[PDB]
Design a protein around this nucleic acid. Sequence first.
RNA 1: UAUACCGCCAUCUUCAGCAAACCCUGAUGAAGGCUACAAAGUAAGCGCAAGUACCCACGUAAAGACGUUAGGUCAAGGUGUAGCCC
RNA 2: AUAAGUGGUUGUUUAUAAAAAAAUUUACUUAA
Lengths: 343, 225, 51, 63, 132
Amino acid sequence: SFFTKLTADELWKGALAETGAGAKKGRGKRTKKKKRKDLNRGQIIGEGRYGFLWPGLNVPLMKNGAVQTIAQRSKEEQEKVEADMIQQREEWDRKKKMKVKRERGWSGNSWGGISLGPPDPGPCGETYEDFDTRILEVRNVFTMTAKEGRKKSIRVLVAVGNGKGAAGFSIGKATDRMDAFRKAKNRAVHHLHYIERYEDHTIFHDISLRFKRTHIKMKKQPKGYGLRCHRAIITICRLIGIKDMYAKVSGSINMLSLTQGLFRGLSRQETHQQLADKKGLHVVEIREECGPLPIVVASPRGPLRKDPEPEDEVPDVKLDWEDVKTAQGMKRSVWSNLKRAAT
Amino acid sequence: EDSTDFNDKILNEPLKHSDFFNVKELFSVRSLFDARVHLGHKAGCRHRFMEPYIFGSRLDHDIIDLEQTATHLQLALNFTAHMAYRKGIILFISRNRQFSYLIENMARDCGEYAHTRYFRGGMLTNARLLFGPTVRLPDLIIFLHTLNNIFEPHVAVRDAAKMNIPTVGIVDTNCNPCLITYPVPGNDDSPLAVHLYCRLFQTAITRAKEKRQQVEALYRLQGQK
Amino acid sequence: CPICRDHKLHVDFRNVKLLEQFVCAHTGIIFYAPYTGVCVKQHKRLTQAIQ
Amino acid sequence: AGSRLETVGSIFSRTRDLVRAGVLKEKPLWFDVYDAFPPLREPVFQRPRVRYGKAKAPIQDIW
Amino acid sequence: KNRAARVRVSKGDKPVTYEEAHAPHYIAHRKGWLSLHTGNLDGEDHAAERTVEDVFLRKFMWGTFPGCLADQLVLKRRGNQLEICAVVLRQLSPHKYYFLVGYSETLLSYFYKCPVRLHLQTVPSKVVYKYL
RNA sequence: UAUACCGCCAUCUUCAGCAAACCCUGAUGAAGGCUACAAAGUAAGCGCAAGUACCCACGUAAAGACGUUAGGUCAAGGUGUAGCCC
RNA sequence: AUAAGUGGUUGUUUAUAAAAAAAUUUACUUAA
Ligand SMILES: C[NH+](C)c1cc(NC(=O)CNC(C)(C)C)c(O)c2c1C[C@H]1C[C@H]3[C@H]([NH+](C)C)C(O)=C(C(N)=O)C(=O)[C@@]3(O)C(O)=C1C2=O
Ligand SMILES: [K+]
Ligand SMILES: [Mg+2]
Ligand SMILES: [Mg+2]
Ligand SMILES: [Mg+2]
Ligand SMILES: [Mg+2]
Ligand SMILES: [Mg+2]
Ligand SMILES: [Mg+2]
Ligand SMILES: [Mg+2]
Ligand SMILES: [Mg+2]
Ligand SMILES: [Mg+2]
Ligand SMILES: [Mg+2]
């Protein structure tokens, strides 16, 4: 019957079954998902199966300054038109079966390390194209509600940084991943630290910090050493601009305590000039590659002092057993100093 | 080249003098003392961050050191005048309901702004949504009382710091001055003290706003010749 | 590997620029093969070239 | 942009550092006035602690 | 919960027209009838034949002006006449619109044995009443 | 095959809540955001409400979100998947 | 201040994409 035929909108809504009890509470567990096809896509008004040519609709109205009459394509000619239509559809479908190469982060199926591009441009023309954004952690967190039940939210941790000392991080909570990436990405640029770097490649001193239950032991290294540190630290270091450093994470390795502790330790990094000013004495660098050449890296801009700081023969510093363990060739881990790709 | 002349004659010139607006003449230790600015709260109310500024306890009543109040008060007035001269938006924030009328009047008289009312959440950290995307936020905030009506720091003190807005603040012995850019230790309860601060910040602002006019008239004379 | 995906990259002792890329600019050391990813074959040829 | 980390450094240090980095393109209106006439104590956030044990307040009684 | 001819709320991003935005309990209150004839008046005949004609024409027009209609047809009848008032879009060639007006009018007049007219009203975009 | 669905409904509902977008709090955890002599929330939309129908400002209708019960209905019609085609 | 026992089994989060169709002759009748 002609009168039982419905519209494409009504037909796809039923066929796709996007709504229903299956969607809710993950009751339906059929990963295979059909997609709506617009079947009007390649359709031309006036073009039909019989191949008639209607002047003013399917073909041009006037030919050689004269009004065309009703004409019908030849059988052999109509075959080509129908055959060509099949080809375009196939090639149109071909485009949508091509798999796009998603550049992978820490792992193939991991969101950590993946880049979210620059933060969205601000309201009043504020622009953030200098900054990069890498994901640090995606987690489906749940709460219970009286009506629905298990309600999923996405907690996302991102870090932003221009690679010139300015960097931050923020958490984003939303029901949709893409809405949490936005919130986390855009909120981070309003919470930027400035991380002082020694020679714009490493840190000034070595940092030993404990944030809650996470321990981070960071070591200043020379050039070429590279970033030999936890995969989340290398990411954040690339966003800060540190290029050569070592860090070992002990205790708990919660991504969020590791981040909040990494940025805290780096924020308390005392500079060489800040030191010279605090002690009021020259800070002299001794490099083994330069013999006893006394390289003065920072001097007190204010008044210089005259009393040699008392040199305590025995330093009352609390050493770390692992440091001394390795120093004395007692640590024999079959995992330390392994050949790894350049970071 | 107009940038060099405009910047030097207007913005850079006043910043080269120790007291470009002569605000030190506006107050004296005798004037502060006569306004009871040295009277603090009792010793059981004291904040430990306000100790550097307390001269002592006179029968368990903290006496604020007016010698440091004067040095701090000058620094706070100097900043205010330089900001008023630079066409900065100055907001006066208080919640002491006894002086809300006084502080609102004073703000209108010097052509500036006052928020003496319940501070709604996000006025500063969420202003482009509460006002409009092109709203201009204050460049300076003057707290005449830094505690809200439950004896805790006004939320704006923290929100000003989050928005990178310098603040001037009268900090009594029970107040928290860690985040205030220019704390001025002094009594914030006595009407004499509150009248004095309003008189001083009004003058400093007024005087600074005239001088900004009385140094662009010289620009006009210099422009002709 | 980097070398074996571009035929126009000839690891010769004459191609000094290419050789420089595979040596530290700070310590003067030839990277290990896992560092850059060049197969065992090419890394040895490279090593000879460097020397 | 700006940094709303009111607990890390001060408005000066944060601003100063963001200008150096290139985030803040324009020095805020108050920056030059602060730089010329800085306050006696830099406004850095500190958490008030309790005095345990023998720690007492250095405030003396005026006699 | 009632469902008939309600567009559900969604997420504040769904463009809906004044017609679509109103539920059946608003049909004589905030909106009118998409057809007007005398069949459904007390004492009148042929409500059925009018109704079959109106279901066909809406279908006829939807497939005859594919992708052009920007709202629902307004069907009118005065004596022997039939008026089809479409709101269409402005993407098709006016040559094609004139072809289709002349075509539809002619074909429908021979099908329903009456004078049939077709009044187009073009709009740039579909008029949005509300973002549900 | 209603446990793939549209369509049209039951049910709480003789409900008042669902909320995008922000901001803040929790050491940047799941989460949380209340005081009017106010102490961090602003919220567009959708319900409720208002309006309209019936003989009124009353009453009765109607309305009544988001969700809950894989609740009902492939036998209203249409339809994804699977099957039948002497 | 009475007494109110029980309920086979089972169950959830693997990742983005887009079209257009269209425009040469802007006014006669006429004749060889
Ligand atoms: C075997 N049980 C788990 C079951 C299975 C199906 N269907 C299938 O698994 C079908 N599987 C195929 C697709 C054929 C491979 C089912 O479809 C159902 C149910 C449960 C029933 C229970 C029904 C019950 N009464 C009417 C017998 C009832 O009162 C309730 C209730 N909530 O109170 C129901 O949920 C019930 O009506 C219902 O809907 C069932 C199913 O839907
Ligand atoms: K079926
Ligand atoms: Mg009902
Ligand atoms: Mg069902
Ligand atoms: Mg159903
Ligand atoms: Mg089952
Ligand atoms: Mg009523
Ligand atoms: Mg009812
Ligand atoms: Mg109502
Ligand atoms: Mg069922
Ligand atoms: Mg039993
Ligand atoms: Mg049980």
